[PDB]
Ligand binder design. Sequence first.
Ligand code: NI
Length: 341
Amino acid sequence: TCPFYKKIPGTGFTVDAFQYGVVEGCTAYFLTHFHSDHYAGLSKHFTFPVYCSEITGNLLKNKLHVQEQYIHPLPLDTECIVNGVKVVLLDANHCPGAVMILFYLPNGTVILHTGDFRADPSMERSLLADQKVHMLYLDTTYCSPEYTFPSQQEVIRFAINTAFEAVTLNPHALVVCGTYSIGKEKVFLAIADVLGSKVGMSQEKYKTLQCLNIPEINSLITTDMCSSLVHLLPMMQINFKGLQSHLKKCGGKYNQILAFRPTGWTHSNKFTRIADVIPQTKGNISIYGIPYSEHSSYLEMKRFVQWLKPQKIIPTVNVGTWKSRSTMEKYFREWKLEAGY
Ligand code: NI
């Protein structure tokens, strides 16, 4: 049964609620982004209206085979009427096609559902600037002050500089980047651009990337592994055994691997600066864990909420334990006392 924090009161709507069967009273199912914990339950047999971004609807049609007649893509930054209720989709600064949803209820209440997001000051000049928000359904993934990580730009600068140095020292080194979902495409695209290579990958991952409306993508990716010196592999294969096995397959074209695992936060964050990150090495294989996050840090989250000044916060992540819930509620109250709302 669908949890309360997935239901939008005063509407027929649910958000990211496809794994509960037919939800009683639901007339429209919104999907914030194409990550499996959120789309869980969707397939070609789904026959209710799904509302989403254009990019998410490309992925629903091509990857999950949802039939076209049930996919309702909406443009961003545009007031739309859905089953009698005004809604707006906003960029969530998460993965490609990810949105936040503004609902203007018939009684005058305004609700923001962030989906998954990485808060940014640029959001302070979107259509959120223009009216009051009563209720915030908040991505609280990293809602504790220990969660610090660098900007995405500092992390990509580190990756490009590391890869370019290694391959210029050894033109027979291969770069490998791990993936298991959409998101974080800048990691492998930025490294292939500095090396003058396309990114090589499986047919299934090429198909996924072709749904993303990324400009000039036909110039950047390929299924011809032999022509590429940046390869994409499943995240599970980014270990010494998996990489040794891959190097065998390349037929002596290469004699070294430099590999990247873009994680979110790891506790090497509470001690080490990005500049000081070092790899794990075994023989001619080195593996870097780089803290590339597509969710808010604690400080980015706190700034967004103190700017928005909502009347009520409903967390959507870390809700299953009483200790997590009590921790989050304490920070919400601190933020409200410090800012004065
Ligand atoms: Ni996500």
